[PDB]
């Protein structure tokens, strides 16, 4: 307040919000063409995704304790509370860059 | 032989194969009625899913290194090489029992 963040930006991400309270999988929300911004900090990575109308569709902090995983070649799932969010990157290269930031922040 | 060991058994599990090749979740598998068995050691937990006919449809070892995560309140994703599977338990209670057993090796 004020501050200047320098973020890694991954344009053209897809976000799928999911649950499993129906004994299968539920899709709660699904959104394309989001701008993902990642703020690399000491012990956590700040994640936020924005629509072209500046809507902040999802925001969280990923730390060593966060339940999360690579999914396939270019996606990442984060589970906070009862729902999970799956982020699908535009390319495997983008995912790999993102993952390396997260591994650094989480102490791996 | 011989020694004693524990086998933790979770009937009514299911396995979905997550498929990425053109976009959406591509079900290479969507198998109902499996029993998941965990054979846990100090540093890795052996997981195997068996059909009613005792066919092993999926197996792996879970350790500190394994790329995996809780999904929702009763599911678990495991990613190995390029491929991911989603295991779904019969109840959130089953999932929590399973998750707790993995805490040592993870
Ligand atoms: Cl910064």
Descriptive account of the structure:
The structure is a homodimer. Chain A is mainly beta. Chain A has one domain (about 1-108): PH-domain like (Roll), CATH 2.30.29. Chain A has 1 helix and 7 strands; from the N terminus they run βββββββα. Chain A has a 7-stranded antiparallel beta sheet with strand order 4-3-2-1-7-6-5, covered by helices on one side. In chain A, strand 3 (about 45-50) and strand 4 form a beta hairpin. The longest helix of chain A has 14 residues, at about 90-105. Chain A is globular and about 45 Å long. The interface of A and B includes residues 67 and 74 of A. Chloride ion binds near residues 5, 6 and 39 of chain A. It is classed as transferase,gene regulation. The entry lists the keywords Protein Arginine methyltransferase, transcriptional regulation.
Chart the SSEs and their pairings.
Two copies of one chain form a homodimer.
Chain A: E1 8-19, E2 26-40, E3 44-50, E4 56-63, E5 67-71, E6 75-80, E7 83-88, H1 92-105
Antiparallel strand pairs in A: 1-2, 1-7, 2-3, 3-4, 5-6, 6-7
Bound molecules: chloride ion.
Chloride ion is lined by residues 5-6, 39 of chain A.
PDB class: transferase,gene regulation
Keywords: Protein Arginine methyltransferase, transcriptional regulation, activation domain, transferase, gene regulation
Assembly: dimeric
């Amino acid at each position: 307040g004020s501050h200047m963040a320098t973020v890694s930006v991954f344009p053209g991400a897809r976000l799928l919000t999911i649950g499993d309270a129906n004994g299968e999988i539920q899709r709660h929300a699904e959104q394309q063409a989001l701008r993902l911004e990642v703020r690399a900090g000491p012990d956590a990575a700040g994640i936020a995704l924005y629509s072209h109308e500046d809507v902040c569709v999802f925001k969280c902090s990923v730390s060593r304790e966060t339940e999360c995983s690579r999914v396939g070649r270019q996606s990442f799932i984060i589970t906070l509370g009862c729902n999970s969010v799956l982020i699908q990157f535009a390319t495997p290269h983008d995912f790999c860059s993102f993952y390396n930031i997260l591994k650094t922040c989480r102490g791996h």
